[PDB]
Every structure is written in structure tokens, then in C-alpha cells.
From a paper:
The catalytic mechanism of inverting UGT such as NbUGT72AY1 is a direct displacement bimolecular nucleophilic substitution (SN2)-like reaction enabled by an enzymatic base catalyst.
However, since the addition of apocarotenoids increased the H/D exchange in H124, these effectors reverse the helix-forming effect of scopoletin and the corresponding H2 amino acids should therefore remain flexible. Consistent with this hypothesis, electron density maps derived from crystals grown with β-carotene failed to resolve the secondary structure between Ile42 and Phe53 (complex II). In all NbUGT72AY1 crystals obtained in solutions with retinol or β-carotene, the amino acid sequence between Ser309 and Asp327 (closing loop) is disordered regardless of whether acceptor and/or donor substrates are present (II, VI-IX). Although all the crystals that formed in the presence of 0.5 mM β-carotene and retinol were clearly different from their (apo)carotenoid-free counterparts (I and V versus II and VI, respectively), the effector molecules were not detectable in the electron density map and are invisible in the 3D structure. This may indicate that the effectors bind in a fuzzy way, possibly through poorly directional hydrophobic interactions, leading to multiple positions and orientations in the crystal that are equally likely, or that the effector occupancy of protein molecules in the crystal is too low. In both cases (β-carotene and retinol docked on II and VII, respectively), a majority of the ligand population occupies the hydrophobic acceptor-binding site in the cleft representing the active site, while a smaller number is bound to nonpolar wells on the surface of the protein. The lowest number of interactions (total edges) was calculated for the protein in the presence of β-carotene (II), while the highest number of bonds was obtained after addition of UDP (IV_A and IV_B), which is consistent with the assumption that the carotenoid promotes protein dynamics, while in the product-inhibited complex the mobility of the protein is hindered. (Apo)carotenoids play a role as placeholders.
Numbering used by the authors: 4 to 42, 53 to 311, 324 to 475
The structure:
């Protein structure tokens, strides 16, 4: 009898999409019915709605009467999935067949009551790195061990068995201990250890030390005590879009000649930074494609209105400007792309490595500042500015230099060849026999034992 698995998605595409990918992986490879309780580029269940993949909508509660302007995104996203858990309660109460296992998103951990009530096998998804996970867990200890803000720390934080996290590479919920988002994060870290397992969007080669720290380190296993499932790198699969001007232009460009630039669906620069980045791209004398959003200094505008005067005119031959959105996976896969300036968001990161593309780390929010150091210091597949671009403007001199490096210098060629090897490792973990294929089959096992 085919297993029935429910998956729960936090709001947004950066949360919904992974969930979908995950679902498709499972269902394609092992034969499992996938229901999703979500709270020309995609088309969701294209033909996947043959009692195979099925998306039930449940995104219904306002929080306007409970937040303010300064309330941080993490807390907001924690609230949304709380206001009316009852909705979810009754949703699962009205499932004609209860699932044999439920897999909730990182921000839908507060659903334990329900999972316990219907007595279903409950699992959590961590859509980013294991290192960030290890932190999220161990933060329940630091909370006490360190007195004062974490950015004030003179020495790094050393998570048992894991690399040392500097005061500059902290995750955002640790920037302010006097906000609520910190408390939520420690609560999160405490919640993980109640689930029957933890899926993580990574593989062995990429994070061997960290994964084997979570699994085996005594100090961590006195907190964790649950299995861990490195199932990644899970990513959207390259779609087909005949008409896609970006592509049509890229088809005229040489192999690995282009640098792609896009800061993900959350990212937004400030006006000056955008001007310096423009002049940087101009002065580099390198070919590029740039997904530009309106510049928030906290702005619906035409492309000319927010970019430097004559920029588009001058760069007409050297670059392609793309307002708002560009189809990210398809560009990343394309032969003429040999570079990616990114916000270090894990989804995008994964998409880059899986195509063997070197990166320029430009962290902005979330955990991205922590992922940047991991890419650069440890993995050597990315470079970054001298000062993190959150703390200080990155002017056109350092930008120019950083561009020329990645693309045409021999060191640039070393970093690319590194990304390529990590692409292979990804294609080895995912393959029929790899660590992540097998690790999935361990999750399968564990859902049948329950």
C-alpha cells in the first residue's frame, strides 16, 4: 500500500517551491502520495494532479491587528502559522485519509499539538544548511552561556564539532536579543528536538563535518537525539520557455562569458549602492545580466528612473538589464553563464553549484551572512567584499576588482573549477546509490516503522 505523506508550506515562493521539489523527488522515486497544505515559469502540478501530487489551499488569517512596522519578518512568519492553528487542526480533521507522515516547513514547527493529536509521524524540513541548523539548535545553550548581544562578542561561537561563527556572520535573529524574533529562534531551536526526524537540504560531501557532528557529537546528541536526513541538493528543474529574451541574448554569448546578478525575491538595494553596482558593472568590462528591483532606502518605477543616467545607453552591448524577475534556474544552467553575484540565499546557492557556476557572495538577510562565510572560507567557490555589504557600501573600485577576478583571472578559474567539482559531488549524492538517495530511503524506512 502506497504511503500518504502530507507536507506543510510556510507562505511565499521561497518556501512553497522547495516543498514542491521535495514532494516530486519523493513521489517520483519511491511511490508516495503527496498532499500539500500551503499557507510561464512553474505551473505547479502541470500534470502532477493525478491523485499523485495535490495542493490544498489554507493561507487564511490576518495579523495586521497584532504586528507593527518594526516587527521583524521571522516573528511575523512565526505568527501567521499560529493565529489560527485551528484552521490546520480542522483541515487534518477533514482529511478523508490521514497521512502516515507529515513534513512541516521550518516556520511551521508550531504544529506539534496537531501532529500529536492525530498521532501522525511528524518531521521537520530545514531548507538551508546543516551548520545553520546546528546553530539554531545549540542557541538554546548560548542564550545562557553568553551574556550580552552576540554582535558584541569579541571571540567567535564554537558549536560542538563545527566551525567557529564570527560576530559578523551571525544569523539575523541574533543581531538583536531585545526583539521577539530572538526568542522565537531559541524556541525554534528547542522545537526541532521534538520531531521524529529532521530533513536538511544538503549532502555529505558538502557538510561532512557538520552532519557527523549533529549525528554523533556527544554534546549535540544530549540536545538532539533524533535522526538527520541529508537529502539535498534539492532544486527546481530547468523548465522550457521558447520565448525568453534573456535566453535569446545568452545564445549569442560565449561559454562562461556572462556574470549573472540577482539578489532573490527578498533582496532590495539602497539607491546609492545600486549606483555603485551599476558603475562597477560598467567599469569591469565584463558581460553581464542583471535582475534589478526598485531601490528601497527603507518604489514602482521604470528602469530609467532608478538607474544612473545614460547607463543603459552605454552598456547596451555589454549587459542585459532585467526588471523585477528573471527565470533563475534556466539562466544559471545556460552555457554562457560563468558567474553569479548572489545574496547567498540557499535556494539560489544550490541552483548555482548544481550548474557548476562560481559566485560572488553579497549576503543581505536571513542566514545569508553565515552561508557566505561557508562558501568563501571553507568551500572556496565564492568570493566576497572586504566588508559585508550590509554593514558598509561596496564602492565601484572593489566591485570592479571583484568582477575581473572571478571571470578572467587564473584565481577566478580555480574557483570555477571548484564549483564544477561540487556539481559532480551533487550529481553523485543524488544518483541511484548516492548518500542523499539512500538517506531518503532511510526516511522511507522510518515512516514505515511508524
Amino acid at each position: 500500500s502506497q504511503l500518504h505523506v502530507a507536507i506543510v508550506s510556510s507562505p511565499g515562493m521561497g518556501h512553497l517551491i522547495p516543498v514542491l521539489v521535495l514532494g516530486n523527488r519523493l513521489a517520483t522515486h519511491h511511490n508516495i502520495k503527496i498532499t500539500i497544505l500551503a499557507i510561464f515559469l512553474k505551473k505547479t502540478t502541470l500534470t502532477n494532479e493525478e491523485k499523485t501530487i495535490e495542493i490544498i489551499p489554507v493561507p487564511s488569517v490576518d495579523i495586521s491587528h497584532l504586528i507593527n512596522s518594526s516587527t521583524k519578518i521571522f516573528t511575523q512568519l512565526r505568527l501567521l502559522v499560529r493565529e489560527a492553528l485551528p484552521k490546520i487542526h480542522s483541515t487534518i480533521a477533514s482529511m478523508t485519509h490521514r497521512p502516515d507522515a507529515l513534513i512541516v516547513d521550518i516556520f511551521c514547527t508550531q504544529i506539534l499539538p496537531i501532529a500529536e493529536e492525530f498521532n501522525i509521524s511528524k518531521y521537520t524540513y530545514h531548507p538551508t544548511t546543516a551548520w545553520t541548523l546546528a546553530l539554531a539548535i545549540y542557541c538554546q545553550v548560548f542564550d545562557k552561556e553568553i551574556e550580552g548581544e552576540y554582535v558584541e562578542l569579541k571571540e567567535p561561537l564554537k558549536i560542538p564539532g563545527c566551525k567557529a561563527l564570527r560576530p559578523d556572520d551571525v544569523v539575523d535573529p541574533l543581531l538583536d536579543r531585545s526583539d521577539q524574533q530572538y526568542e522565537e529562534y531559541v524556541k525554534l531551536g528547542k522545537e526541532y528536538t521534538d520531531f521524529d526526524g529532521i530533513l536538511i537540504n544538503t549532502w555529505e560531501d558538502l557538510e561532512p563535518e557538520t552532519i557527523n557532528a549533529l549525528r554523533y557529537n556527544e554534546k549535540l546528541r544530549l540536545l538532539l537525539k533524533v535522526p538527520v536526513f541529508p537529502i539535498g541538493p534539492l532544486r527546481r528543474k530547468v523548465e522550457t520557455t521558447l520565448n525568453d529574451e534573456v535566453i535569446q541574448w545568452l545564445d549569442k554569448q560565449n561559454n562562461e562569458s556572462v556574470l549573472f546578478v540577482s539578489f532573490g525575491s527578498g533582496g532590495t538595494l539602497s539607491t546609492k549602492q545600486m549606483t555603485e553596482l551599476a558603475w562597477g558593472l560598467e567599469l569591469s568590462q565584463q558581460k553581464f545580466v542583471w535582475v534589478v528591483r526598485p531601490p528601497s532606502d527603507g518604489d514602482t518605477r521604470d528602469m530609467s528612473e532608478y538607474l544612473p543616467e545614460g547607463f543603459l545607453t552605454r552598456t547596451k552591448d555589454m549587459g542585459l538589464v532585467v526588471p523585477m524577475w528573471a527565470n533563475q534556474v534556466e539562466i544559471l544552467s545556460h552555457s554562457s553563464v560563468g558567474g553569479f553575484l548572489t545574496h547567498c540565499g540557499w535556494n539560489s546557492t544550490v541552483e548555482s553549484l548544481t550548474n557548476g557556476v562560481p559566485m560572488i557572495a553579497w549576503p543581505l538577510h536571513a542566514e545569508q551572512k553565515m552561508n557566505a562565510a561557508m562558501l568563501t572560507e571553507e568551500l572556496g567557490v565564492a568570493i566576497r567584499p572586504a566588508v559585508l555589504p550590509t554593514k558598509k557600501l561596496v564602492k565601484r573600485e572593489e566591485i570592479q576588482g571583484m568582477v575581473r577576478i572571478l571571470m578572467q583571472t587564473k584565481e577566478g578559474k580555480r574557483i570555477k573549477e571548484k564549483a564544477k567539482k561540487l556539481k559532480k559531488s551533487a550529481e553523485n549524492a543524488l544518483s541511484d546509490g548516492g548518500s542523499s538517495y539512500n538517506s531518503i530511503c532511510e526516511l522511507v524506512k522510518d515512516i514505515r516503522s511508524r
